[PDB]
Amino acid sequence: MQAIKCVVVGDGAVGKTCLLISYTTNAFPGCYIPTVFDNYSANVMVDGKPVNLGLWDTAGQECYDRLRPLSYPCTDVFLICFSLVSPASFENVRAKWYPEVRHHCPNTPIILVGTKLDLRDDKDTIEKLKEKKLTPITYPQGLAMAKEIGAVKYLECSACTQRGLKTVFDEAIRAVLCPPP
Numbered sequence: 817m818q819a820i821k822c823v824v825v826g827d828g829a830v831g832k833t834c835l836l837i838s839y840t841t842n843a844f845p846g847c848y849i850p851t852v853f854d855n856y857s858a859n860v861m862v863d864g865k866p867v868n869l870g871l872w873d874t875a876g877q878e879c880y881d882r883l884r885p886l887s888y889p890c891t892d893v894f895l896i897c898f899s900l901v902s903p904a905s906f907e908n909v910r911a912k913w914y915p916e917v918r919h920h921c922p923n924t925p926i927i928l929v930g931t932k933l934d935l936r937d938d939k940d941t942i943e944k945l946k947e948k949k950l951t952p953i954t955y956p957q958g959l960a961m962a963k964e965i966g967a968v969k970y971l972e973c974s975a976c977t978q979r980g981l982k983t984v985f986d987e988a989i990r991a992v993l994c995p996p997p
């Protein structure tokens with residue numbers, strides 16, 4: 817029936833691959849590639865609506881700044897990801913990922929995703945940031961960024977515990993099925 821293309825962007829090490837693997841397949845060996853004959857699209861059904869959600873991961877490296885935008889054509893929604901325990905990835909949304917997604921696709925919906933939510937309350941992770949004079953991204957800080965980039969939604973998730981993870985992909989679909997003109 818309905819086809820929705822979703823592209824995930826954001827810094828290396830923020831959890832983009834793990835977010836996709838954890839949502840589609842659980843377990844370390846699940847780590848799938850598009851070459852898998854089983855399928856690439858996802859079988860999702862919401863409020864009686866049959867949606868085939870195609871998921872695309874991205875090489876976040878500076879080297880592939882020329883090759884990564886080739887997957888941007890015909891994207892219905894973007895997930896812009898930053899790690900909630902990395903302030904550098906957060907400011908890379910401001911300086912790189914939002915300008916890049918907007919330059920190539922001016923009218924496509926953006927969902928801002930705060931990743932690694934489980935590590936925001938982690939005592940060791942918090943101490944290690946504090947040593948470098950850094951702190952985790954709070955819900956007000958992430959919501960503030962979402963407003964600055966005019967994102968359709970701000971969501972926080974963990975791929976590791978699966979907290980809020982399913983909600984991210986459900987909202988990606990709702991951004992396309994219930995837009996604003």
Ligand SMILES: Nc1nc2c(ncn2[C@@H]2O[C@H](COP(=O)(O)OP(=O)(O)O)[C@@H](O)[C@H]2O)c(=O)[nH]1
Pocket residue numbers: 826827828829830831832833834835876931932933934935973974975976977
């Ligand atoms: N605690 C924790 N670690 C995570 C989560 N997601 C990814 N990671 C870890 O973060 C690192 C980067 O993950 P990956 O998905 O490859 O990053 P990508 O470069 O953005 O794709 C790996 O060491 C993962 O195990 C998470 O939700 N919680």
Ligand SMILES: [Mg+2]
Pocket residue numbers: 832833834874
């Ligand atoms: Mg990756």
